[PDB]
Amino acid sequence: SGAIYVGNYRVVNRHLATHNDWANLVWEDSSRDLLVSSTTAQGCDTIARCDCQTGVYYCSSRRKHYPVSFSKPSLIFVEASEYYPARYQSHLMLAVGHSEPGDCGGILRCQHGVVGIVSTGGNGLVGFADVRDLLWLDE
Ligand SMILES: COc1ncc(Br)cc1CC(=O)N1CCC[C@H](C(N)=O)C1
Numbered sequence: 001s002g003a004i005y006v007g008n009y010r011v012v013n014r015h016l017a018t019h020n021d022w023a024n025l026v027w028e029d030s031s032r033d034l035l036v037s038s039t040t041a042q043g044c045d046t047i048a049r050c051d052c053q054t055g056v057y058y059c060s061s062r063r064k065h066y067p068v069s070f071s072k073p074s075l076i077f078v079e080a081s082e083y084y085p086a087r088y089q090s091h092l093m094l095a096v097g098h099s100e101p102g103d104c105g106g107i108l109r110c111q112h113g114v115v116g117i118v119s120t121g122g123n124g125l126v127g128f129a130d131v132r133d134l135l136w137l138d139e
């Protein structure tokens, strides 16, 4: 679990969105596993605007942060789950690292700010849904 709080927005994995998230829907994309809902309280997370390929992610299944090198956002094939059939997920970045299903929502950050959130994993690889292209999160 986990979210990014920026301005009047809440960014979560789409497969984990709540009833309140859908009732206050701003934007959602199944192909990216992202959902953004509006909030009354103001968020303070800084979104990174960069092309960094190194950062640190929070892994709740180990109560630890891990440094990783990650790929550039791209279309990656993701196995079927209870939330989606087998498909290509877009804007996905992979790193060699540990994750379990409950790790989705952990933040990946670089020196410039928040890069994305854990979205997929398996076989010793962790995938993060990039959010750096969503320029509107700041305005
Ligand atoms: C961090 O997730 C995981 N990590 C390790 C294993 Br094994 C398994 C996972 C779960 C995972 O990859 N999923 C399930 C939930 C929806 C996901 C999606 N974006 O399509 C795919």
Ligand SMILES: [Zn+2]
Pocket (backbone or CB within 6 Å): 048, 049, 050, 051, 052, 110, 111, 112, 113
């Ligand atoms: Zn950066």
